[model samples]
Target: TLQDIGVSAGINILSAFVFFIIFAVLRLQPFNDRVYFSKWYLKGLRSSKFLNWMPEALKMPEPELIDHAGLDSVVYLRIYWLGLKIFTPIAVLAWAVLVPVNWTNNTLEMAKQLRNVTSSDIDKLSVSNIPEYSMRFWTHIVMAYAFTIWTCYVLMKEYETIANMRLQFVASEARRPDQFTVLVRNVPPDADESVSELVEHFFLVNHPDHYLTHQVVCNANKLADLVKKKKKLQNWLDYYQLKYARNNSQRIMVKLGFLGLWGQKVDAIEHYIAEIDKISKEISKEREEVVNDPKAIMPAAFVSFKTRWAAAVCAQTQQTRNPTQWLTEWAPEPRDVFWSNLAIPYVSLTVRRLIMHVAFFFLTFFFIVPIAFVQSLATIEGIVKAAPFLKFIVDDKFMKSVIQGFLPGIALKLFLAFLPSILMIMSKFEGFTSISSLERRAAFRYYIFNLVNVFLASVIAGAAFEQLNSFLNQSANQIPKTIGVAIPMKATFFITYIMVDGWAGVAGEILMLKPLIMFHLKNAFLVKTDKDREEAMDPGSIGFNTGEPRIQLYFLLGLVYAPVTPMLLPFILVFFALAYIVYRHQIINVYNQEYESAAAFWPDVHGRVIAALVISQLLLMGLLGTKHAALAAPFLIALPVLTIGFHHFCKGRYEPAFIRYPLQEAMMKDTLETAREPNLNLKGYLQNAYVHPVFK
Candidate 1:
């Protein structure tokens, strides 16, 4: 069992090396530009390169990169840096303290047991190498404290530092429009008046001094259809125009029918040109109808104020005696609003969250059945039963060879691939008001599914639903130890899981696999405008959704394994450095930010990490109590109480800084900006900012 795991690890490192070299080669080609380094290209780095890439980026560390990369990038990069800071010392300390403690134990060596899975060299240091009951388990409990203390201190510095980083970033960029507007939703319905009148009457009377202007959201996705057709025809017209410029020949003929599947072949160039003329005229007519229509107006509005101080108050204050109506939040930055959702009525919105959660968990609760069956079919006995023709194949000892190695990860790989998108559509229906909110929602749950589907189901090899309940029937207090006994048996599996799914994923990061097709089909054949369309490299934002969630999985896995099987300890930090190096390179030049939320999502990031630590700390308690040496018992109870206590302490001290706007920071800037643009036009500055994109 263990020999092939070593072979698989060897194979993956070699696989990773090849991926990096090929990625280096891909960046050498200049055509990959606007696609690869579009972040730097547009930011005036004058179109960057590969070997010149790594060294220049290394010198361009986090402090210097802030101006070039923006605060979101700095926040993102620091998380990668934060992972490295917490782990490097933990790895070294664990190696010196716990490794030899587990290593020097040989209880299994003297007790002869043949044909058992534990008979392997790797366990020479595993706590599994010892008997179930021992006084020596004290070293693990003591060392867990050392690692926990180091993590607590590092988190202390990062939480405080990021809060200040967020404040200074928001304050320095004083001209950004969101600084003076609140996104007001669930406006109290008035039977006698229009949305516009109610908005003007409520704020005009209530916030007489501060109210500057407002824009109610409007719907014209009815017109959105026509707008899309015209845009497509214009793009088709441009592509054919360039084709004519290039070949100067056959004229690009195609069928003038649905799916291009029927009717006589027609010259695409002539068809697209005439089509654009027809659609352009119709859009102008419909556009007038939409703009003149009052029915399109929604209850939500961007309520603006005369100063940052006023907007902060209105945004912060609960606007009415009732909490549900006149709902308010600081507006997400311009491109960040999802106008389609703002119109949902309060009754309708609350019910949808109830409905989608039912939809979401049924998907979670039963989704594994499909993977579970396929995986059950994935075994040696399973393989022989599913295809009896393969009995000759299973009979060969060499055939028994790679069966366990690669086939298991495939069902899980298939299981692993989906949940991001499943929750994405869940988010669409949950009717969140902004893109930042939707991405944050998806990330939190994606971390849950990652923990559920991968480590929990993948390692324990039982139906995930029952294993969750399996501990219940045991002596209840005996639950963690039963689960603990199951955990170390899969130690070698997680080692390869890190190397294969986790590390190979880092390799997959640089390959530009998706972009290879994105650029080749979308831009390389066509648009000169992609020179600017580069902004939407499919709007190439960082994947805080799954990417950072994926980053947490590494830490969660590391923290779990740190106490139980410290043999495979140092390997996680190697992964952190590799992950940090890849992502920082990707961020400085490749990935871009969609909008800023002043790192308000920072609280979720820290909170989720602690959530994993609680899971980790308890499993250590689980592991030791099974040693039946209950002497370490009372001490185990103390750790998580303080651990949970620490989370509240941190949340109380710093979480408010991210979520609430301080009145002092608002007023201090009110005077400072007055020193510079003392006579700035509050009216004109915000006039066009809140208007719908279609209206603009």
Candidate 2:
């Protein structure tokens, strides 16, 4: 009997350990870049500068000048650690303090309520009953709340990490420096071979389009001037330039074609600025040589059609006026522009879901506040009868109800809400396949994940509330009210935690992770599959696109409510599921519509934006004349303010979204003009002419 008992206990302990580990891994999937370990050890070894002599101590094989296939795991692990920097504290609180406290309380209460300790001195059950209760309680909690939902996040995150590593490894193996250059001639024969060669190499490797041969006089003059000033280009350009001249430019030329690195990576236009700086350096040096040349003319600064059109239109109509006057928008192939345009709103720094939520708060506030108040009043009035200390915020009917339903529901909503969308989007980018077609399906999963998270959080929160009620009941004999009244005391903490989590955490993930997943997936799957052979995942092809800021915008949502965070932290976790569910649906729809039939999607967003306007109008009418309306008055007033705030925020982000898109800018510019001439209607001509090897 003793041997059998020990073996059973050992099995139970092992089971719990496995369960907890699995839960932890699943919860980490959305932000896997931080928590996953494959890259952490490697990063620790290579970049140990902060650790003093730690790098030297590890003496990690002087990291290969070029990373090998296995290095991706190391890289991804490091990134996972970074993401963990943000999430771990929250995870720890939930796992260690929150869940355990709730579990312990539930176990104790259930055991006590069980039929009298059957064998204790002939009247009650023995200590053995306690362990059985604990086991039964914990098992239910794990299976119901922790297992399936959390595991999804872990799997998606891991898959993405591997995909990213493989992409990068392949790209590196494919190309070297020189094969990517464009030969720019017209330098005066008097120019330094080394500096001119350096400039050519830099332009070739870094920004091939910009380095394409221009007419000799302006470039030759610029080169002479750059050398005279003795300045060099920025790091990337400089590195390429020196590398080019050292090995002879031929190697760069060969690398360019072989690796298929000749043309633009989505944001090559931005990279051009840095490449020009390289030319300016050589121009400074070669300037003295050109000062003596009879044909030398002043150097002309390179101007993008977007900039020139903006300036010209502004000159004609005034800067504050419309800018469409002199521009002609010739978007890339309609399909490409359509896809990219749909993607624009995601990249901008708008706290989209949060705004929707705040708006939702006001719209639904009238209905919910009363229900919450009644429930909370009953619960809290009970608590107040027991422990008067519990009366602080839950004293009033409205506040009490807010604490009960509104708070906890919001927290559960938040966690379960945006997580799946982020995971789904991230998973799409975790490989080289087409997910645009799968977006709707992916979004469906996002909602499902959110629903599951809601169920789990509810279970966790319910267990917690029950445990708290029991603990308070234990003190009921000594305190203000009876055991029956003490139950309401636990309600306050429960609702409060949910409200905070729903508003803050779920809203935050919507803004940050959703866009990142969508856009990054587009790059990985929809854009092109440039395979990397050696690495299990591809980092070269898997980098942040720097295309749209949809993901970065999420950070803004967190900051908007930051001031209220300190006060809200105590009970913010209640709505984790609901918040995610509500907003993840919103984002998923946007992305799905983006890839589905564009014809269907644009109208949908327009409808939402317009609906917000309509709601704003109704709210204005509802709040202005009534007295009882003041109950939800603050939320009402914040609605239009948030709307206008969102609009202006969109306006400010206009540049990043459409500015570099010359075709779009040109169209807007042309539309503004009284009588515009499309001089650069010559875009196709420009591409053909400038890209030619013999243009000079």
Candidate 3:
């Protein structure tokens, strides 16, 4: 068994190494220069260094290159860095302390000898080897405290450092439109005035001294769809034009029906050109209609003020006697606005959030039931019955074995693959006005799902809701004891999981095989112009909504296993180290941030880490109690309590830096700006800044 494990370990290591080699080689290629290093290219800090490119291109980027990306990039990279720092020493301590404690005991082999337990060498190498009621668990209890203290220290330091960096980043930034603007939504209507006129009159009346300009957003859902359709047609036109340029002997032909399946044949180039011309005229008409039509304007406006101080005051203060009527918030950057949500009424938005929250809870708990039912249908027996023609294939042992082995896993993989998009849709339905907020909300939902479905399901071997129901039926104090008894028996499974998912997954992130294949496909089929090529390059964003929560899963695993399964610690450490290096390089050279929130999501990050710590502490208490070390439970329970208090301390001390713009800081910035540019025409600067793009 040990030999089998050694071979598996070797394969995992080799596979990880192969992926890294592929990453390094592909990143060096001239064609992939933008694919790998778009951030640097965007910043003009580095360019396509394809000229002298053999070894130099593969060299590790400097710290300054990563720094140049932004505080968000640096902060993301620090998550992995934090993992490494926390786990590296913990791994050393586990190996030094727990390994000897475990190895010196013969509880597992003795149990096997007496036919009381099934055992393996891996069991002897784990804490499971220690005899019940033995003094050995004392070592684990002490180390658990040590690990918690170390983690708290590191997390506190990181929170402070990132918060200070965020404030400095915001303070040192040049003028941005959002800094002087507040997004006011749910403006109450007046029969006599248009939404635009009402917004101007209200702001001029209430904020007479500071209000400078306002731009009303339009209800342009239909217009936007038309614009999207026209852009698609224009791209097709470009493709056909390039096609005709190469070969002018015959005209391009296409069907005039849905998806070109039926109807009259037409010259594709001529067809697209005519459609573009038609859509262009229609767009001009729609633009004029949107600007002049009273019904087109939504009850929302981007209201800019004469100073950042004024905008901050307006955003944080009540605008009217009816608090629900005119809602205000610091305007997201123009690019960050999710235009569709701008028209969501305040009451409808609240109802949508409540509905989505309830929906998310069921989605998380009941998600696996459907996946399991689908997986059940994917069995060899079910497949043969469903497709009677394939019954002959089922007769073959090899085919039956292959089908049985692969189908369920494939079905499960597909469900998990599509889950993020489903969650994102749920987030959109909740009506957040900025992509950042939507992503943050989705990320939180994803974390809950992973914690319940993946982590608990793996350890407990049941549907999430089944486990929840069982736990609910039990006394609150008994639930941990129920799961704790299963923890050690499942340690080997988690070890293998960390290798397959954590070690291999981090390696695959660098390979970026999905994006790589997509980029090549787009370049080959869709790219005809320089702009098309740029679009085809596919430099993706950080995907905070999906990515951060995934990282939190690893944190949960590391903390849970640190005291019980120290062997899993080294695998986790490798994951963190590998991920840090890989993601550090990625943020430097790859992911172009869509919007810089100045690491505004840090509080969520900090809270989730603490949540993981609390979970680990509770599980440790349960484990020790299961081992008959009842005295240790009291000490272990205190860890979660103390950790929670620390979290509250952090929330109070630092959360305001993210949610509030201190009036003092705003006033100081205002003073400095006034001194520097006394005659800056604030009104002219903001005049046409927030006009809906459809109108422009």
Candidate 4:
């Protein structure tokens, strides 16, 4: 099993373990909180459930979180250790079993020895006539590599799936609504307290049989009046908003769940409002709280309500526009919402029943069968040689190339690897329209956040490892105090002049740098002068979602410090790490902004993705130049061609990035008009908005 070892193997395995462990435990909290990993509280803190099994002496102190722990926390915390314990023993046993199987059948070296012996003594035996079994040693060596890569990939995916499943099982527990109460007041003076009180009192009285876990305060403003213009359109120009926009907006948003596309599905929402109609007749006396405030500036006269739960338990048909809104908007539970949400995009019968059963299994079959068969054949000669068993398997060169070392194996793995993507695409399609515009925006972020992680990690892990030390040091030294201090000054000047004007760029002055710089410069030239092109494309902006220059800038800074300031790597790494973490949450903001202005934020993400590729090439320049320089010259020259080929592939494969641009523009125009339309159909809002094509 260990016969085909390389130095990179241990490093790769260890790094994978470290990354997996970090993601498994430590990742959950930051994930749940939707906060920055770089946040002061999380600095190097790894008490996350994944690390709990280390000797108590080595463990970091687990801090007391908010008194009420989320359902995800308790479950992940428990199973994390248990799963690790269980899996560790199983992995060890499997590893142990594999060793004897490989050792006694030592097959890799025998072939080389036979060939060498034959080369020297032509009279002894012709190489062509020699039995292939005599060369079993080399066969075994190739088998070892195939086995290791497959085992690692499968084991990792399996471990993750099991851990995820275990956590999901624990989160389906009970809680009451009164637990999430909030005060609401500062409504209009015209709103009556008696009618509102009945609505508020419904939580404890009308729903006496059922426990209410969360408390929601209804604002003093009457729902209808909030949207109505003052005095028969006397305030037609939104003058009322000048005086009461913030309060009015908050009031409208609080009840928006009841008023939007899901308005019809709020369960007892209409019933409660109708009850207020009846309560108004019975109670004549005005409450002092309302009279004193006049403007209803306090919560005393406002209503209370229960928070909405996600539609995970109910059938898919019963779901509102926001299937997982209850999961996301609500506070964190003891269990991870990730699995439920992860399951969410896959939960539809169309996705699971239709997809998982047919496509997943078929894909898995396609993935596993031939590889196993070929792998078996790859070692057949070695197997026969060791046992002196009768040889029956085919050993022809064409058969060997087709079975043992063909590109089909790689092709199958890639297809199988992407089967989940099919499920994801289908899931998104099923839930696409049911969700409100706002919710879709939110959901989009979550999807992109995860997608970006998958993309970046796969593309950049090795590159990141190579450049991490330098990136950290330079970023730290560049801004000794804080990014806030220098980013505005430097980023602005760099963008407006240096980068836009196009002088120098990453890995400057080298032949490799010319094409990279020229591409960006051409882009910048088009953006500044070609109004049509700029309008055709989403204008570049800098923010967490504004992925490009910023991501590249961040990565480049880190790279510059590799040799000098490795210590600062952690500090600099925090920014992008946090950026990744908060990426999903950022989608809502980006979506809203898109709605506010018909602009797409995909440009930012797209830019960053492209920038990452460029920076990777830049980093590779050094990698080849330093240690592997002999291989560097050709690689540097090939870089541009490779990049162009990748671009062509992306153009063909990534529909969101390249296709449907005209449709997107039309949608954005429609979204703007619809947002201004009075009483627009909430269900139509997302569709009305521009269709943002996701570019990689």
Candidate 5:
């Protein structure tokens, strides 16, 4: 029914341009600076007159971008940079070496002459164009090796560069609070000693020369909740007070009921102040009880050392019998700690990990049943067969085209709207102790879900559980072959997907259309003062979970298709270029980074790209075997092994830099700081740093 990838039926090109041309031209105006340029707005950046179409985000440099958004933004742009350049050469090589060889072969399918295979000129442009049992497959095989060499070289070089950047930033920066502090958990409760006394004495004895003051954690969660409620009530108090100030003649009234529904009326300002006072008292009372009580103290402490070297020594090593007591880790910055997870016991943490592992597995597989059902219903034939009640509903041509064009994209788009919160909560439940770690863990989980539920599930046109069942029965060697066979078949589907998801996704990112609508609505309805409008401008962070993994998804697509479909190559290259420009501008203008995170997510990023390489090699081997290039199939086997070797080699060499602080670097920074700030009173600075705000 479809000819040369719908170019036979035609016009996915115009579809891509619908969002492409419209969204690029649609972006940016004066009123929506908060929506598009909040990072710039936060810094009070502007020109005197506002109509510069050749605008400022493009005018900025990385140094200024780092000044604005921190080094994470640079590393993020590095990812896009790495992605764009990798494909630029790849597309050239495939076009030069592979495309000519693939096309010149007299490989037309006789089965298609028998009306079995469906294709148009798109097939002629693919590896599928090559005749089976032909020697021309050697060209693909050799190019695969050459491409692998260049990629591995690029990855290793990028790793060295990023590691240098991270080290330079960490060493050259002014003092950070975490530099001298160690988080010691599982402090091993004692009946004879108080938690505070135990922590102080234990670290004092262990590090004798380096030990400084320790701050023991307390379970102030209840008090924290009360403080949170008080803060919300205070916001309403401020809003009513502002209203009263604006219109002194009309006194505001309130109903002292459940959600202001039906009870005794009072002055709005007065009623909210009473509520604020009520929560404040509850907060203070709970905090007082928490501080006075011994059991409320947790067996965890932020143990400060006199020097960064000493802190790194304690953070890097294990101490205490059985390694269950005095468990130490490098503390996240004070702002980054997830307070509720701070004192979760080692035993409970292990069990939570086990439970969450099973839950994540269940989520990845079964979440697809509903998604696959949606994909099924979205099809036109499925829609008609299911619609016994809608005899005429199926009669409309526009409605038929609408159903065919709409469902899966919207389902994907909807999930993109709200799924990160799910994994983030699960990551917390597993007792990850910091915002950065949870984000890392969530990204790891999301990456796996993408590979299984999105990438593999799309190819098989099966639900995740169904794919799981079939893959289990298929031999490991045979599995890639089966998936490889589907690759070209799915290749056709994904060109439109690239246009629909990739192009539009970048355009959507640039415009931030939904946020524009939401922010302006909030601005019109809720904003009263500059402060109110500022409060409403929630410029979301660059969550490595969705952002990084989606880029990896694009990377995997490029690697999977580069040799198989050279025409598909340029579209992915276009995507990375578009993504790079948009994200560079977004980082420069819109992002309010949540955690400096300091490129902690890079090792995972490196590993996934290598995994995609291995997956591509194996699938290439699998597809080559089917194409009757038995000799070529065997030759391709060495590429994955070598790729895996390089991945392991790089990990062994550079991964530790991401995970552990070096003693040499720490001591040097410590020495320089000791010379200049020898009289530094870090005590007051760190005193309440770890303390819950509710107690303060």
Candidate 6:
């Protein structure tokens, strides 16, 4: 396979190039203008003033245009920058220092002369050619240290940059309702007072000086359902109205049955009209019930304060002696709320989290079973056993080759396609109160799954169960040793993986093929008005839950292979370089943000990179041990220990910068607001801020 490694590399490079060209062309077209450059359009930067016909359309947007996209988008872009920063020099060093030293060795030649080698050009050029226990392993050891030091320096610099950006973004940003509000959940129920009354009295009593207003959360599930049903009926009404406008004599008809299979025909316009009227009444009645009924109110409220200082203090400090009874968090933006989960009991949330933890553990390791089963069917004998009629056609060499090459990947792809949904369900079961928090939690878990199932499994051949067996059966020390020994031989496999998965995946993202096709289909078949067109155009947000974890996967790859397979470094660097440019262009133009968490996910990002570093150090230790460089293993062990300590040091130094608003920052803002807008209507501004959308 190494014989044509260059051919595979050439194809992938061409694919990436083609994706870039396609992105350039599509982004310039006015038809795809919104779909590709919504960030600019939303920010009021890309306007009619910029001539559509000019070559300027193909160029990158102005700095002001990109700046308006938001700090979260910019921070996400910085992750790709971090990757490139960390890996670029490492790649250069690997090629300059390690490659020649590796090439000069005769290990592969010796193996070939003894008729014991695969005779691949890769083995001759890679660390595999460095004779075991030879002095040449010293170069790898030294280069590993160099790479680690460089990566840490870059990570530290990036961490500081993102932290400062987040702090400044929070402090200097325009005023938001969430800045002056705290989401208080798990309020203790009282027989004497309503949830609303209890919330008002409790905040007024405990936070009397600063408490301004509060909105008790309502159980609006029924109201929401009714509103959604009414909307659907309204759409049907609109469709029929359009049809009637086109032809006055003819009336649209429909059958009322299961999917219109068996029932009497009815006037479509009148049916929808009647349904809409009924749902409208239901929505009004349900909204009234949610507003007025005591039982319909939840034990949660968005409590607003006179100042940001008060809100920040309440959010960061305990409100009650019994901590579980009254929990306060910085209220997410109104649009960010997942209203249904607002009332989850503290005990129930804990139980759900425990259950999901176990479920995720099993899901990660056991996921291979289904994929393996599907992969088995791709074989000639297995296909014949499963579908006897296809044997004749499948037995043809071309067909067999196609099946062998493609079928195995299909099963894995299909399984991976549903993974986000699966993880989201797990997160929901874990009882996150907001969609943003749910996604953040899911992203964290997804990163773990990717590291174990995708990254580790790809490097070490066999089922996940087999990997687990080896992991458990062997000592912790032996496990990495087993994997490290195989690492050098698999450089070519990983190189191809980086191209197909990393390069192609990043390129394909620009095409937006799935969303593009769906949009046109909906536009052609369903859209009847501006509103319908607006609804049909799915301007999806940057999928932090999925996208950030994938970038972490790349980080894991770069860190793991940096020392052992320096030749693989260039591919990884190229991936990061392309990813940075593509994603930078995307966040500038595409990726509508759902909610800004002020780069709250940075701590997780930092922690994950630290985890990757430790893994790399341990593997290097294992690899060195296999080289009979036992003396170097002690030094390698120190790397992980020191790396972990450095992680702790950074966690203490910078993580709080993200998780907490410094009282000093809050007080300064609060003081300025009081002086600048002393008589502002704080109550009016906040009284209706937290009302359920169903009620609105």
lDDT of 1 by residue, 400-481 (tens): 4445554454446566676787787788776687888898889887888777766676555533233453344434353444
Can you list the residue pairs that collide in candidate 1?
536-539
Q: Where does model 4 exceed 4 Å of error?
A: 5-59, 63-80, 87-419, 428-696
Name the lDDT of candidate 4: 0.30
Cα-based lDDT at residue 205, candidate 2: 59
lDDT of 4 at 116: 27
lDDT winner, 3 or 6: 3
lDDT of 5 by residue, 27-116 (tens): 534566556667756667652222232256477676666566888888989999998778888888887677543434455654323322
Per-residue lDDT, model 6, residue 462, is 34
The C-alpha stretches of model 3 lying farther than 4 A from their native spots are 1-7, 45-67, 102-134, 240-278, 369-415, 462-482, 535-538, 627-629
TM-score of every model? Answer: 0.86, 0.24, 0.83, 0.24, 0.84, 0.85
Worst 10 residues of 5 by lDDT: 1-10
Model 3: how far residue 284 lies from native, Å: 2.8
lDDT of 4 by residue, 431-512 (tens): 2322222232332343343233322222233223322424644544522222112122222111111121111111121112
Candidate 4: TM-score? 0.24
Model 2: per-residue Cα lDDT over 513-601, one tens digit each: 43445445533333323332112222221111110111112111111111111112222222322232432222221111111111111
lDDT of candidate 1 at residue 47, scale 0 to 100: 48
lDDT of 6 by residue, 394-451 (tens): 4565445434433444445556777988998889875576778888888898899988
State the number of backbone clashes in model 2. 114
> Scored by CA lDDT, what does every candidate get?
0.72, 0.31, 0.73, 0.30, 0.73, 0.72
Task: Name every residue pair that clashes in candidate 6.
Answer: none
lDDT of 1 at 135: 50
Highest-scoring model, TM-score: 1
